[PDB]
């Protein structure tokens, strides 16, 4: 399950090899009343960029979106959907911004269409700046 890739995949603040005679894992609460999920504590995964078990700090803005693509490795694309007002025609126009959000692997079952909440953090890659903090399931689909 773990140690897929080239280097050893461990959490950097834990010292796992103290002399004996299950590893403890580092995890934190990210503030703003976000409940850390049970799979973050009970899991066995590693992640640099998970907000709950990694070296990121959720700051700034706390936005939302709908899951619209999950084709990437440990990041999804959300589709922020909003309106915009022209001062001439007292009307609106429906716009959107697709944006790439690092989805931690503690959110283990999510399908596209779910309304996730994201938080601004350190820029994790070129076009990724947010993390999925909590996931709210789409309407219906309880089965």
């Amino acid at each position: 399950d773990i140690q897929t890739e080239r280097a050893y995949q461990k959490q950097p603040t834990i010292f796992q090899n103290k002399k004996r005679v299950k590893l403890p894992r580092y995890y934190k609460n990210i503030g703003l009343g976000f409940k850390t999920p049970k799979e973050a504590i009970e899991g066995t995964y590693i992640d640099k960029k998970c907000p709950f078990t990694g070296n990121v700090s959720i700051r700034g803005r706390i936005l939302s979106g709908v899951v619209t693509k999950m084709k990437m490795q440990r990041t999804i694309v959300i589709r922020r959907d909003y309106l915009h007002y022209i001062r001439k025609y007292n009307r609106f126009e429906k716009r959107h911004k697709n944006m790439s959000v690092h989805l931690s692997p503690c959110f283990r079952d999510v399908q596209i269409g779910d309304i996730v909440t994201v938080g601004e953090c350190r820029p994790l890659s070129k076009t990724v700046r947010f993390n999925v903090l909590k996931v709210t399931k789409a309407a219906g689909t309880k089965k």
Binding site: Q3, R6, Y8, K10, Q16, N17
Partner: peptide
């Protein structure tokens, strides 16, 4: 290196 990371890098 000692531990499971030592066994990891040794089998690598």
């Amino acid at each position: 290196l000692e531990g499971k990371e030592l066994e990891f890098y040794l089998r690598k």
